[PDB]
Scaffold this active site. Structure first.
Site, PDB file in Angstrom:
ATOM      1  N   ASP A 167       0.916  -1.133   0.077  1.00  0.00           N
ATOM      2  CA  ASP A 167       0.127  -0.063  -0.123  1.00  0.00           C
ATOM      3  C   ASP A 167       0.833   1.194  -0.016  1.00  0.00           C
ATOM      4  O   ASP A 167       0.595   2.277   0.594  1.00  0.00           O
ATOM      5  CB  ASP A 167      -0.986   0.089   1.269  1.00  0.00           C
ATOM      6  CG  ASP A 167      -2.053   0.938   1.098  1.00  0.00           C
ATOM      7  OD1 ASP A 167      -2.436   1.229  -0.033  1.00  0.00           O
ATOM      8  OD2 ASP A 167      -2.771   1.118   2.186  1.00  0.00           O
TER       9      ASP A 167
ATOM     10  N   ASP B 136       1.094   2.838   7.740  1.00  0.00           N
ATOM     11  CA  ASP B 136      -0.030   1.732   7.291  1.00  0.00           C
ATOM     12  C   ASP B 136       0.171   0.488   6.731  1.00  0.00           C
ATOM     13  O   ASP B 136       0.146   0.194   5.587  1.00  0.00           O
ATOM     14  CB  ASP B 136      -0.902   2.610   6.468  1.00  0.00           C
ATOM     15  CG  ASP B 136      -2.157   2.020   6.101  1.00  0.00           C
ATOM     16  OD1 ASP B 136      -2.381   1.069   6.721  1.00  0.00           O
ATOM     17  OD2 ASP B 136      -2.987   2.538   5.154  1.00  0.00           O
TER      18      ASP B 136
ATOM     19  N   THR C 299      -4.991   1.140  -3.561  1.00  0.00           N
ATOM     20  CA  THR C 299      -5.479   2.071  -4.303  1.00  0.00           C
ATOM     21  C   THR C 299      -5.102   2.222  -5.627  1.00  0.00           C
ATOM     22  O   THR C 299      -3.956   1.941  -5.972  1.00  0.00           O
ATOM     23  CB  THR C 299      -4.814   3.452  -3.732  1.00  0.00           C
ATOM     24  OG1 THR C 299      -5.542   3.429  -2.234  1.00  0.00           O
ATOM     25  CG2 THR C 299      -5.314   4.652  -4.280  1.00  0.00           C
TER      26      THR C 299
ATOM     27  N   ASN D 220       0.722   7.346   2.696  1.00  0.00           N
ATOM     28  CA  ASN D 220       1.343   6.393   3.610  1.00  0.00           C
ATOM     29  C   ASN D 220       3.008   6.483   3.780  1.00  0.00           C
ATOM     30  O   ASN D 220       3.410   5.918   4.213  1.00  0.00           O
ATOM     31  CB  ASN D 220       1.047   4.940   3.064  1.00  0.00           C
ATOM     32  CG  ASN D 220      -0.392   4.531   3.562  1.00  0.00           C
ATOM     33  OD1 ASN D 220      -1.004   5.168   4.359  1.00  0.00           O
ATOM     34  ND2 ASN D 220      -0.875   3.558   2.778  1.00  0.00           N
TER      35      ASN D 220
ATOM     36  N   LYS E 212       2.235   4.809  -1.112  1.00  0.00           N
ATOM     37  CA  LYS E 212       1.475   5.779  -1.869  1.00  0.00           C
ATOM     38  C   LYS E 212       2.088   7.074  -0.725  1.00  0.00           C
ATOM     39  O   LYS E 212       2.309   6.966   0.196  1.00  0.00           O
ATOM     40  CB  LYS E 212       0.070   5.827  -2.067  1.00  0.00           C
ATOM     41  CG  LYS E 212      -0.548   5.442  -0.893  1.00  0.00           C
ATOM     42  CD  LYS E 212      -2.248   5.100  -0.935  1.00  0.00           C
ATOM     43  CE  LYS E 212      -2.978   5.056   0.296  1.00  0.00           C
ATOM     44  NZ  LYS E 212      -4.306   5.016  -0.023  1.00  0.00           N
TER      45      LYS E 212
HETATM   46  C1  LIG Z   1       0.750  10.149  12.891  1.00  0.00           C
HETATM   47  C2  LIG Z   1      -0.416   9.479  11.937  1.00  0.00           C
HETATM   48  C3  LIG Z   1      -0.250   8.212  11.875  1.00  0.00           C
HETATM   49  C4  LIG Z   1      -1.446   7.823  10.839  1.00  0.00           C
HETATM   50  C5  LIG Z   1      -2.265   8.501   9.864  1.00  0.00           C
HETATM   51  C6  LIG Z   1      -3.204   7.864   9.391  1.00  0.00           C
HETATM   52  N1  LIG Z   1      -3.181   6.499   9.173  1.00  0.00           N
HETATM   53  N2  LIG Z   1      -2.584   5.640   9.864  1.00  0.00           N
HETATM   54  C7  LIG Z   1      -1.472   6.296  10.754  1.00  0.00           C
HETATM   55  C8  LIG Z   1       0.521   7.665  12.303  1.00  0.00           C
HETATM   56  C9  LIG Z   1       1.485   8.020  13.276  1.00  0.00           C
HETATM   57  N3  LIG Z   1       1.456   9.416  13.356  1.00  0.00           N
HETATM   58 CL    CL Z   2      -0.055   3.068  10.706  1.00  0.00          CL
END
Ligand code: A1BB7
Ligand code: CL
Length: 276
Positions: free
Chosen positions: A138, A160, A179, A143, A140
């Protein structure tokens, strides 16, 4: 595997939201015992075995299992895991500089040196993962997260791991699909997948970093997917007229339909555009 079932609010205080997806929300948090800050990712669990809403326990356990293995400057790390009846809660490293996606939107396009500054870190992170036989699946700009967006050369972390899988047999053949703009042809065609899919995604990211344009994007998801499968992309002169031929070579060697002919992560690090 079971996780800590005490109320997370007994050990952490939550604050601003840092992300929101189909089956997960991320909130900044602070551990009461240390004062250290993290990102709490709340993943909604499935309420029934045949439900299509929420994430299956198998999928949650896979993500946790992969996250527990990784420790590298360019990948997010996992601090702790909690759960209750409705969610699994991942206490993750806080990456507070925002998405590479948003940083790019605030600069239009990058110079080749700015692009390679980011790309070298992405490649280092993916080298680590691939060395561990972990396919991210994933990759991108959304991420990729910056530690601090107000420095000349921002540091990044890959986040992610919700689609990540261990590739112990060279390929896997499961329900995996990211995506449309970033997925490899083998994903579009429901073929066995391996570490090569990530290298295609890196090619897409690189194209975007240098031009501010998405190489396969159509007006609908199905059109995008069709473009990906046909390798329907080109270097528009308006965007690439002053981009080096070697940068284009790098991209061209990643956006290859046949996964066996695509550059590997090791190849990408030795490519003349990247190699010091
Ligand atoms: C800030 C944001 C994130 C985040 C944001 C959106 N999706 N997964 C992790 C992980 C760690 N710090
Ligand atoms: Cl994450």
């Amino acid at each position: 595997t079971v996780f800590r079932q005490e109320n997370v609010d007994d050990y952490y205080d939550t604050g601003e939201e840092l992300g929101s997806g189909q089956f997960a929300v991320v909130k900044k948090c602070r551990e009461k015992s240390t004062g250290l800050q993290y990102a709490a990712k709340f993943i909604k669990k499935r309420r029934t075995k045949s439900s299509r809403r929420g994430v299956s326990r198998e999928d949650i356990e896979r993500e946790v299992s992969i996250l527990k293995e990784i420790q590298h400057p360019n990948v997010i790390t996992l601090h702790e895991v909690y759960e209750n009846k409705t969610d699994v809660i991942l206490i993750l490293e806080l990456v507070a500089g925002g998405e590479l996606f948003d940083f790019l939107a605030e600069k239009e396009s990058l110079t080749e040196e700015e692009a390679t500054e980011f790309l070298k870190q992405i490649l280092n992170g993916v080298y680590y993962l691939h060395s561990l036989q972990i396919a991210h699946f994933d990759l991108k700009p959304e991420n990729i997260m910056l530690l601090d967006r107000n420095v000349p050369k921002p540091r990044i972390k890959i986040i992610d791991f919700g689609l990540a899988h261990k590739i112990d047999f060279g390929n896997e053949f499961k329900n995996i699909f990211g995506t449309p703009e970033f997925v490899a042809p083998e994903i579009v065609n429901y073929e066995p997948l391996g570490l090569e899919a990530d290298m295609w995604s890196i090619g897409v990211i690189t194209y975007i970093l240098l031009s501010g344009a998405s190489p396969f994007l159509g007006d609908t998801k199905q059109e995008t997917l069709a473009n990906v499968s046909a390798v329907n992309y080109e270097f528009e002169d308006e965007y690439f007229s002053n981009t080096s031929a070697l940068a284009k070579d790098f991209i061209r060697r990643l956006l290859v339909k046949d996964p066996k002919k695509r550059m590997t992560i090791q190849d990408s690090l030795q490519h003349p555009w990247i190699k010091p």
